[PDB]
Design a protein around this ligand. Structure first.
Ligand SMILES: C=CC1=C(C)[C@@H](Cc2[nH]c(/C=C3N=C(/C=C4\NC(=O)[C@H](C)[C@H]4CC)C(C)=C\3CCC(=O)O)c(CCC(=O)O)c2C)NC1=O
Ligand SMILES: C=CC1=C(C)[C@@H](Cc2[nH]c(/C=C3N=C(/C=C4\NC(=O)[C@H](C)[C@H]4CC)C(C)=C\3CCC(=O)O)c(CCC(=O)O)c2C)NC1=O
Ligand SMILES: C=CC1=C(C)[C@@H](Cc2[nH]c(/C=C3N=C(/C=C4\NC(=O)[C@H](C)[C@H]4CC)C(C)=C\3CCC(=O)O)c(CCC(=O)O)c2C)NC1=O
Ligand SMILES: C=CC1=C(C)[C@@H](Cc2[nH]c(/C=C3N=C(/C=C4\NC(=O)[C@H](C)[C@H]4CC)C(C)=C\3CCC(=O)O)c(CCC(=O)O)c2C)NC1=O
Ligand SMILES: C=CC1=C(C)[C@@H](Cc2[nH]c(/C=C3N=C(/C=C4\NC(=O)[C@H](C)[C@H]4CC)C(C)=C\3CCC(=O)O)c(CCC(=O)O)c2C)NC1=O
Ligand SMILES: C=CC1=C(C)[C@@H](Cc2[nH]c(/C=C3N=C(/C=C4\NC(=O)[C@H](C)[C@H]4CC)C(C)=C\3CCC(=O)O)c(CCC(=O)O)c2C)NC1=O
Ligand SMILES: C=CC1=C(C)[C@@H](Cc2[nH]c(/C=C3N=C(/C=C4\NC(=O)[C@H](C)[C@H]4CC)C(C)=C\3CCC(=O)O)c(CCC(=O)O)c2C)NC1=O
Ligand SMILES: C=CC1=C(C)[C@@H](Cc2[nH]c(/C=C3N=C(/C=C4\NC(=O)[C@H](C)[C@H]4CC)C(C)=C\3CCC(=O)O)c(CCC(=O)O)c2C)NC1=O
Ligand SMILES: C=CC1=C(C)[C@@H](Cc2[nH]c(/C=C3N=C(/C=C4\NC(=O)[C@H](C)[C@H]4CC)C(C)=C\3CCC(=O)O)c(CCC(=O)O)c2C)NC1=O
Ligand SMILES: C=CC1=C(C)[C@@H](Cc2[nH]c(/C=C3N=C(/C=C4\NC(=O)[C@H](C)[C@H]4CC)C(C)=C\3CCC(=O)O)c(CCC(=O)O)c2C)NC1=O
Ligand SMILES: C=CC1=C(C)[C@@H](Cc2[nH]c(/C=C3N=C(/C=C4\NC(=O)[C@H](C)[C@H]4CC)C(C)=C\3CCC(=O)O)c(CCC(=O)O)c2C)NC1=O
Ligand SMILES: C=CC1=C(C)[C@@H](Cc2[nH]c(/C=C3N=C(/C=C4\NC(=O)[C@H](C)[C@H]4CC)C(C)=C\3CCC(=O)O)c(CCC(=O)O)c2C)NC1=O
Ligand SMILES: C=CC1=C(C)[C@@H](Cc2[nH]c(/C=C3N=C(/C=C4\NC(=O)[C@H](C)[C@H]4CC)C(C)=C\3CCC(=O)O)c(CCC(=O)O)c2C)NC1=O
Ligand SMILES: C=CC1=C(C)[C@@H](Cc2[nH]c(/C=C3N=C(/C=C4\NC(=O)[C@H](C)[C@H]4CC)C(C)=C\3CCC(=O)O)c(CCC(=O)O)c2C)NC1=O
Lengths: 164, 144, 174, 177, 177, 177, 177
């Protein structure tokens, strides 16, 4: 993964040396953010089925051509696979808050998404329409923390930049 | 001519002071900005005062609220949809006290026991559906 | 005729800050006792309803039988949800000092739904009277298996307050 | 240079203007006690985001009828519009403390505000009360008697500037009553 | 005038029926908590001249146009009549708290109070503030939530009497509105 | 092979020293809560067949593509051997609990399991889901925490054993992952 | 390579001096405004892809002769390289803003870029206009004055961080000129 612990232990391992004093100031900064980040993971873990229901059909309200014969939302069961396709990306945002870094996104959700979505003819612009809705239907304090709404929104822009 | 042209436009002189300690660093900039109604930070004020006044014992009396009507929802006939609708299904307040914080939260809460979760009736539509061809059982007569 | 968190249409957390608590703690008589009242409950909220439902099983063992209403493991899991949702509204009602939010968002229409869903209403008398008799013993620190450190004094009037709130639940499902 | 800062507010358009280091040094000796007055502006406009966010919430803290069903701070937008005007009132008072003149406070902010609040049905008796909380903050920030936040200032007495910013907040109170 | 026991009599004189035991349990409970009603009356009459001094001068704080020339509380003669009225509303509420019935407050103090205050020209949106500032101060000493002047009571629930006084002070506010 | 009482000996043979008060009191704390230990292995053996009958049904209900052809539980002989594969790995945990040390399952059960599951085409992640339910089924029985079935013991705490089998079921899981 | 703390050490090692207290003045000020720097990098990285696809589209709409056959953005291979020739400029600037020193873009990006570009035939006057547009977008995100997207910060001033990042973009233009 990519987090704060895996980064300083790799550059220690890639230089043949013990954990130095700069390798412990970094994990000190994991203590000063876990109490401002794990409550963003707490809110998303109990409210996911309501935030994926409204973000999933915000793309079908935007791109209404997908419900045509020959398209990506042809029948009902391919619409239900898309809601399953979107409820994975909210699950991995939840894992990046728990780990702290962006490892779970760019190793389970981003890596290889260009080859898959070109082959199976899935428009990535409807993925980023379902993720930009969540980032905006994001009133700050109301839904989450000060940053807890800063942390949660910092990973919803990692998806949009990686799918564009 | 009696009413000034400047009232509803919501502009205001925003003053910025810059000071770095030196003498040649001390500008004041009185420029004009149309200020904007910040929609999102009102919910950090409107909700927190709505639970400040929820927990007042002596401001829920001498400040009594009016009798708000419910919405235009139609009664169907089954009480598990009429009395407990899908917008308020399984919602409950969870109070999370800490040092100098009350922190109630209303979110959909449930179960566990044995594996399954309570809900699994109203799953999301992408989670289930069209797995197998689905048959139906004949009438098993009576017996004696 | 419910209360001021009519925030069921946008935002719900509504926390209360630090110096705004001093606007509240100088406003509530025995406010330090009432903040220690709800903290003795919601810290032990998972152990109570695991013991409240299984106390109902231990006296009425026919619920696990086929035909009973705590077979088919989701239906067991719905009772641990609804054992806790009753406790979750009572702990807000002890904090607010009124039961009007408990009567209108939780107890309203509960009698018609338990006879429609096939819920045995007389066993849920027994499972909530356990949660009455549990939370009396938490708030007076007479819980035998675990005792909580508190400041010295009595909490009798809050113990008589919560016995009225759990009896409102027993009145609403009777 | 001081007359040109009236011209960017008259024109009803975003145009910026400023002072130099030497033009301020000629301004701070033309006006007496001019370093104290710029500390009086900087004590407020560094905390202007907290002063309206306390006074609007302090108005609900003694009157919870404004957030009632039927209240004037309800439907998620009136609360946002209430914070907008208390931001505007704190801008025009602190500009009047910066200018030393209430003549820009009356016709640009308080002219016709009394008729505008009763056209909307804004309760003016609570909007007195949200200004008087902000008046109590402005004499506490200037005299450095604020409890939770003390800014380090050069030493001396600033009692005339606190009474001057008291008197500018009464003109907000006198216009909308 | 009527009290809490006499309203039970004059409701059952209207039905030509003897007062049975099914109507005595609201009255047998009244003499049971009757000591703590008397215990909470003299927390109001012993703090009364500070309550009228606070509730009038806080109404001046919220509405500063009362002391402008042409204001209703302008000169010294009009200022003392406003202090005399808030003592009278406090006197008649503290009869109705003692009697347990709002008969005597209604027909000696509130009888024609609205038509008097229109004819004098007393503002009705400021005079409801002075009965609501002291409404909150009357649920202070019953609930013992006072900032200064803690009073030595006996322990128990008094929120029935705190809610009964808040019924009585809004009976004034529904009469002069 | 060797229990915990003979694990402390073979760690001491390299020391070439007698066993004394440095290393005996943990074995004294073994015996002094030894009545708790075999009180806990009773409530696994008593309901073990219902555990794996729920564990493999819970495995297939989450991933229903194991009974489809191509899944490794398609044939009845693929599903009959799924029980006996999922019964031996539970049986070896019951040896580690009774003997206290996990030396029995690491070599007679787990040595060569990772290489056989990828030789026979057994899906690894499906078994690790099945053994994790047996981890959860155990700790709901050591401490009487399971919902539908409980039994009566002597009043006490047994969290040392419930954290021990949770260390016994992931060394099975790390041998397959 | 050299951040804001490594810069003051190599200038003290030139004199073989200790880093005392008068030279720790900018470094105690670097840390005190440390959250604003992390709030400034977060506003660039979060919308970097829109920042590039708007900068080179804005370069083409001004110079439409870049995409003609014979232009330097003609083919798909040439336009794809321009989309990362200006995405790697924005990357090394955000390294320089994070570290508070320019020794990473001047040692890994700007060194020898001018003769790399005229070996390929890249028009430098249009490469500077693409960088110049990104500089205008960068200061519109440090300061919260972007038209189409507002972000959520605390209250205060970042005109020193806005002008620091505008000085990092000007040495990119001074390198290929
Ligand atoms: C763990 C990470 C993880 C993911 C991110 C997804 C990614 C993903 N999605 C699909 C598969 C799919 N994804 C979609 C999704 C969409 N089509 C649309 O109309 C919209 C553009 C969009 C949702 C709104 C659809 C319709 C399919 C099925 C397409 C097909 O196979 O014919 C597949 C092929 C295998 C499968 O069908 O499941 C994969 C790997 N799956 C994963 O396992
Ligand atoms: C430069 C001109 C200018 C001002 C002087 C202020 C004054 C002002 N406020 C509002 C508009 C408003 N003002 C308030 C304010 C309040 N209501 C309350 O309950 C509180 C006591 C109080 C402040 C906290 C509200 C709630 C609205 C919205 C009214 C509505 O939505 O109906 C309007 C809009 C009227 C219109 O556009 O027709 C104006 C001009 N705002 C400005 O733009
Ligand atoms: C698709 C179908 C399906 C199932 C069969 C269940 C399967 C199931 N049961 C449990 C969980 C459990 N399963 C048992 C097993 C039993 N309970 C008893 O008391 C008996 C002795 C025995 C059944 C005969 C126990 C004791 C627990 C723990 C307590 C509980 O969660 O109820 C778990 C653990 C949750 C997890 O994965 O972490 C799962 C998946 N769930 C499902 O979704
Ligand atoms: C995990 C991350 C996460 C989010 C990003 C949000 C996203 C989000 N917001 C809302 C819900 C809402 N969202 C808003 C939006 C706004 N209010 C305003 O004043 C502005 C105009 C605008 C913010 C820019 C409003 C008013 C509601 C209440 C119901 C509604 O109107 O939709 C809902 C529906 C459920 C609910 O009411 O809570 C969801 C899923 N919620 C989450 O759980
Ligand atoms: C519980 C009910 C409740 C209230 C009664 C009000 C709280 C409140 N605070 C102040 C008073 C004040 N408010 C501030 C403002 C601030 N102080 C800081 O340190 C920050 C920089 C800034 C935003 C928080 C200042 C400086 C004072 C004066 C000194 C003080 O009393 O703290 C006043 C005016 C004078 C007074 O009565 O004390 C009121 C009404 N808000 C509520 O929620
Ligand atoms: C199978 C049969 C079976 C039962 C009949 C019940 C036994 C049981 N225990 C309690 C009673 C209680 N239960 C608790 C709950 C707890 N104590 C703690 O220290 C924990 C924090 C928490 C979860 C264990 C408390 C505090 C009491 C009251 C004091 C006590 O009796 O221990 C009650 C309610 C009081 C009453 O009898 O009315 C019952 C019915 N449990 C069973 O398993
Ligand atoms: C922000 C969160 C928050 C809390 C959780 C409570 C916690 C709390 N309670 C008390 C203080 C107290 N708490 C109790 C309550 C009890 N004591 C008993 O013996 C009973 C068993 C139990 C009743 C439930 C009593 C009797 C006092 C002392 C009197 C009082 O302050 O009310 C104090 C003051 C301690 C001190 O004076 O230093 C605090 C901080 N208050 C808070 O502000
Ligand atoms: C916009 C930029 C800008 C400013 C913010 C001011 C800042 C400022 N004011 C003073 C200097 C001073 N500032 C104060 C002010 C105060 N003393 C108090 O005790 C009160 C709390 C407070 C009044 C409200 C006083 C009394 C002096 C000394 C008299 C004077 O020099 O005018 C000094 C000189 C400090 C020194 O001695 O070196 C400076 C830099 N001037 C500017 O150009
Ligand atoms: C404009 C100037 C201005 C004032 C003069 C005060 C006036 C004032 N005081 C109180 C508030 C109060 N008034 C009293 C009464 C008293 N206090 C004591 O200790 C004595 C026994 C007694 C007379 C001196 C008390 C105890 C409170 C605090 C709230 C309460 O406990 O009722 C309230 C608000 C009541 C409410 O809405 O909840 C107001 C407006 N406030 C102002 O803004
Ligand atoms: C039996 C019950 C009973 C009362 C309630 C009072 C009511 C009352 N007040 C006044 C008379 C008055 N009342 C007020 C009062 C006020 N003006 C304000 O601005 C405030 C809102 C308010 C004080 C809180 C004033 C100012 C006058 C004098 C009017 C004048 O002199 O022009 C008069 C005229 C005759 C007289 O002065 O006696 C009467 C009947 N008297 C009673 O006998
Ligand atoms: C001659 C005039 C006269 C009085 C002043 C009272 C004095 C008084 N009050 C109470 C007695 C009481 N007083 C209270 C009241 C309170 N306790 C609190 O903590 C609350 C703050 C407050 C609520 C308003 C309560 C709860 C009792 C006990 C109930 C009772 O004994 O009747 C008692 C009974 C026993 C005692 O406590 O002494 C007496 C004699 N009676 C009189 O005859
Ligand atoms: C000494 C310790 C010891 C073990 C660990 C097991 C290991 C083991 N498993 C199997 C063999 C097997 N084991 C399984 C079991 C499963 N496959 C799955 O997909 C599920 C994850 C799981 C059921 C829950 C299956 C399906 C076979 C294949 C049997 C066959 O070839 O027909 C075989 C022999 C090959 C065969 O049976 O044909 C052996 C030795 N047996 C032991 O003696
Ligand atoms: C020929 C076609 C053509 C265009 C595409 C635009 C391109 C464009 N945009 C901006 C200017 C800008 N561009 C952005 C960029 C963005 N704003 C956002 O909200 C997104 C996050 C992001 C991608 C859209 C920002 C923030 C500014 C500065 C503020 C603004 O003007 O909006 C500038 C700066 C002017 C300059 O100094 O040269 C130019 C050329 N103009 C054109 O003539
Ligand atoms: C760390 C800093 C760093 C860089 C900036 C680039 C610098 C760079 N750019 C190009 C190469 C190029 N760069 C451009 C870009 C442009 N030409 C234009 O006309 C537009 C003005 C502009 C787009 C913004 C083009 C068109 C090529 C050549 C592509 C080709 O020749 O096929 C090449 C050689 C070809 C290659 O290797 O792909 C190199 C080394 N590399 C680096 O390591």
């Amino acid at each position: 993964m990519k987090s704060v612990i895996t980064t300083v232990v790799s550059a220690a391992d890639a230089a043949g040396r013990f954990p130095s004093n700069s390798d412990l100031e970094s994990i000190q900064g994991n203590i000063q953010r876990s109490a401002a980040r794990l409550e963003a993971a707490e809110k998303l873990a109990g409210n996911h089925e309501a935030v994926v229901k409204e973000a999933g059909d915000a793309c079908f309200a935007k791109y209404a051509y997908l419900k045509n014969p020959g398209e990506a939302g042809e029948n009902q069961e391919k619409i239900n696979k898309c809601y399953r396709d979107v409820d994975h990306y909210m699950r991995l945002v939840n894992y990046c808050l728990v780990v702290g870094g962006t490892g779970p996104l760019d190793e389970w959700g981003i890596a290889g998404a260009r080859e898959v979505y070109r082959t199976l003819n899935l428009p990535t612009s409807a993925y980023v329409a379902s993720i930009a809705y969540t980032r905006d239907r994001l009133c700050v304090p109301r839904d989450m923390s000060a940053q807890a709404g800063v942390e949660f929104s910092a990973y919803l822009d990692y998806l949009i930049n990686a799918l564009s | 001519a009696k009413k000034n042209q400047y009232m509803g436009t919501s502009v205001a002189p925003e003053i910025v002071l810059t000071d770095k300690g030196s003498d040649m660093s001390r500008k004041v900039k009185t420029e004009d900005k149309k200020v904007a109604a910040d929609q999102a930070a009102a919910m950090g004020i409107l909700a927190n005062m709505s639970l400040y006044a929820s927990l007042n014992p002596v401001k829920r009396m001498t400040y009594k609220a009016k009798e708000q009507a419910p919405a235009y929802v139609k009664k169907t006939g089954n009480p598990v949809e009429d009395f407990y609708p899908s917008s308020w299904r399984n919602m409950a307040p969870v109070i999370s006290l800490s040092a100098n914080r009350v922190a109630v939260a209303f979110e959909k809460i449930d179960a566990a026991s044995n594996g399954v979760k309570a809900n699994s009736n109203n799953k999301p539509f992408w989670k289930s559906g069209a797995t197998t061809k689905n048959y139906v059982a004949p009438e098993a007569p009576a017996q004696s | 005729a419910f209360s001021r968190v009519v925030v069921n249409s946008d935002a719900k957390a509504a926390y209360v800050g630090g110096s705004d608590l001093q606007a509240l703690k100088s406003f509530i008589a025995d406010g330090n006792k009432r903040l220690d009242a709800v903290n003795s409950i919601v810290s032990n909220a998972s152990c109570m309803v695991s013991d409240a439902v299984s106390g109902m099983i231990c006296e009425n063992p026919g619920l696990i039988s086929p035909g009973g209403n705590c077979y088919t493991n989701r239906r067991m899991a719905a009772c641990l949800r609804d054992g806790e949702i009753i406790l979750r509204y009572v702990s807000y009602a002890l904090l607010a000092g009124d039961a009007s939010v408990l009567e209108d968002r939780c107890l309203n229409g509960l009698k018609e739904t338990y006879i429609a869903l096939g819920v045995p209403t007389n066993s849920s008398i027994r499972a909530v009277s356990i949660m009455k008799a549990q939370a009396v013993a938490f708030i007076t620190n007479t819980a035998t298996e675990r005792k909580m450190s508190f400041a010295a004094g009595d909490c009798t009037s809050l113990a008589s307050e919560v016995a009225s709130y759990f009896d409102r639940v027993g009145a609403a499902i009777s």
